[PDB]
Ligand SMILES: O=c1[nH]cnc2c1ncn2C[C@@H](CO)OCCP(=O)(O)O
Ligand SMILES: O=c1[nH]cnc2c1ncn2C[C@@H](CO)OCCP(=O)(O)O
Ligand SMILES: O=c1[nH]cnc2c1ncn2C[C@@H](CO)OCCP(=O)(O)O
């Protein structure tokens with residue numbers, strides 16, 4: 208599964224159709240991925256994670272700051288799956304930004320976005336040193352870009368065209384993290400926070 | 402409302418937490434459950450802006466509208482307990498045909514879908530007989546169809562193509578109501594569950 | 597299960613500690629059962645239901661008006677369990693208020709807001725069972741504490757002999773637009789008295 | 791206000807009454823604070839926080855690890871407030887384990903903690919943060935213990951005032967375990983030894 212394939216000609220949604228914070232009212236252009244759609248895809252990704260990794264103790268590794276929202280919501284759906292099934296597995300958590308406890312564990316890396324792939328392969332190479340039982344990477348967004356070194360994560364929320372997006376903890380110079388939707392910035396917004 | 406164009410491909414069923422047996426029946430997911438909620442949250446703010454100045458009587462049109470009704474009212478309630486402006490609401494449920502607690506009240510009619518539009522016009526004419534302050538209609542869906550009488554609701558979630566949809570309490574021959582997403586039913590599906 | 601037992605000495609919670617609609621600010625006295633506790637209890641009920649009734653086609657009967665929100669929340673949890681079991685059984689819904697020939701030979705779940713004297717439920721049971729379903733089960737969110745002698749198959753909370761409002765339960769059709777189960781104040785009682 | 795006061799007499803809730811992860815079925819004893827009750831209190835805290843700190847740019851500071859759940863849920867409710875109004879304020883976030891702290895200067899800083907016991911962890915952190923001269927600094931703590939061993943600090947925002955017992959769940963841990971639990975619960979003796987370091 209390459210994830211939800213969002214087309215190159217995807218226009219997004221008009222801001223007036225959704226609830227968005229007033230302080231970003233002119234800094235955004237379009238709602239690109241609605242927060243609810245993210246939840247729906249995340250609920251499905253949780254089931255996939257549970258089918259590949261639920262056979263042994265999982266350590267969910269959050270990649271701060273961008274991934275913390277996807278991380279929290281993904282773990283929620285996994286916990287929901289685990290208190291309503293008789294098939295369940297314990298989970299511990301850790302956080303990192305760009306550790307001997309990962310050895311012999313099923314390590315799940317939770318990331319916000321993969322672009323060139325450099326961040327993750329750096330992260331993976333570091334993790335593999337401590338010899339886990341398996342390493343899987345869940346990435347909310349994967350871009351179609353020629354700058355890609357060729358890396359693909361194991362779990363994908365949305366596959367998107369090479370366009371700069373913000374929201375759902377993804378930032379533009381630390382701004383737009385306080386935004387539930389994933390959106391594209393206006394010409395005003397970029398200038399304002401550059 | 403959110404305009405879903407005719408050439409909209411939709412989403413593959415495999416992309417969401419949906420049982421795979423709904424594959425032969427149905428076709429694609431057109432409106433994910435989460436997309437409904439986000440739109441619905443907005444509609445709650447719109448409703449509370451236009452009809453917030455007077456006691457609202459929320460009128461649920463069973464059966465197809467009960468989920469949209471439930472969700473829209475949760476978002477209204479969330480607004481009412483987290484801001485300065487709020488208004489009391491009462492609720493009521495109705496169903497329509499086959500083949501006075503509204504007097505001086507702000508009546509909000511909550512419908513699942515508007516096709517030709519004369520279901521609402523007939524309903525709208527029965528109300529306003531008992532002289533309310535205002536009647537407004539919130540419909541989750543509106544179809545683009547050449548069979549439309551020209552009626553347009555005051556609150557629209559999504560404007561969809563002329564294809565038969567199911568899910569989110571919407572049905573085809575009393576089927577597929579428990580589906581959490583709005584999807585298009587296939588021709589084979591239609592014949593399969595045809596009465 | 598007698599459900600979550602709520603003793604008569606329980607004072608509930610202060611209104612200033614929770615989010616309350618401003619038009620019921622002095623109409624209420626104490627929060628009795630927080631909305632989230634209702635959800636947490638309801639989530640458990642859904643699995644108890646599916647453990648007993650989940651072996652056959654389920655027809656959920658919603659008793660309007662007071663039960664509609666308990667019905668909707670209970671159903672979402674049941675629908676969630678249904679699609680998670682990888683064995684989705686037919687689940688159809690219906691509504692009654694105080695031609696249901698579609699109850700024959702199926703598992704009928706009656707969903708009600710509150711049981712006191714039990715006369716409401718006795719009346720509804722005689723009508724339904726005059727259609728011969730496979731089984732009749734009654735899920736009631738609230739049961740008050742020697743009247744007649746009836747016990748629901750599924751109970752959310754066992755509450756004292758006290759008039760409560762909220763979560764679609766009403767006082768003269770008011771307080772329905774409230775998420776918490778709360779206790780009405782003296783000023784509120786006289787305000788909405790018939 | 792000391793938040794939702796939970797009496798020392800509290801028996802809690804039986805585990806069979808709620809939905810709990812089966813791998814903790816014997817490791818817990820009683821459900822102490824239901825997850826849904828936590829949410830409802832957090833929704834109220836969000837408006838209390840916003841009503842006091844919404845006047846200027848807010849920097850939300852999450853105290854890892856146990857602060858992660860409270861932090862995510864609190865900011866969710868905050869976001870709902872900021873998009874349901876005519877007036878709202880921009881917010882930036884950061885995560886600390888106990889950015890250049892000069893980013894706190896001139897800002898309304900919100901410290902989000904999971905639990906306060908002696909109060910020393912928060913007192914020391916407060917003293918440090920105040921040196922960078924923020925516009926204001928407030929502390930939000932989900933749980934506050936009624937303990938003899940308290941230095942005497944009390945947060946600006948408090949979810950629950952719990953008795954001097956050891957609880958887990960909703961990001962609060964016992965030797966890194968029970969973070970995958972939504973409810974706040976009391977750990978059993980069986981689970982106390984099962985994951986004992
Ligand atoms: O669309 C975006 N929005 C916000 N930030 C973005 C975006 N793309 C890239 N970044 C920068 C960075 C985020 O931490 O991604 C690096 C991923 P890589 O190492 O190239 O594979
Ligand atoms: O696409 C659909 N899905 C499910 N039901 C549908 C659909 N279209 C029609 N109905 C029947 C009914 C729903 O209440 O609509 C009639 C309204 P109208 O008088 O034509 O404006
Ligand atoms: O605590 C309450 N709040 C609001 N209404 C209440 C309450 N108790 C009773 N009712 C009346 C009615 C609600 O539909 O329930 C009757 C049940 P019964 O026939 O006595 O077994």
Ligand SMILES: O=c1[nH]cnc2c1ncn2C[C@@H](CO)OCCP(=O)(O)O
Pocket residue numbers: 856904905906907908909910911912955956957958962963964
């Ligand atoms: O009940 C608990 N469960 C899990 N962990 C706990 C608990 N109490 C304390 N901690 C550890 C730690 C929380 O970060 O306490 C430091 C706060 P203090 O300086 O003592 O006021």
Ligand SMILES: [Mg+2]
Pocket residue numbers: 270271273274318319320326
């Ligand atoms: Mg990243």
Ligand SMILES: [Mg+2]
Pocket residue numbers: 462465466512513514
């Ligand atoms: Mg209809």
Ligand SMILES: [Mg+2]
Pocket residue numbers: 659660662663708709710716
């Ligand atoms: Mg009733």
Ligand SMILES: [Mg+2]
Pocket residue numbers: 853854856857903904905
């Ligand atoms: Mg801490």
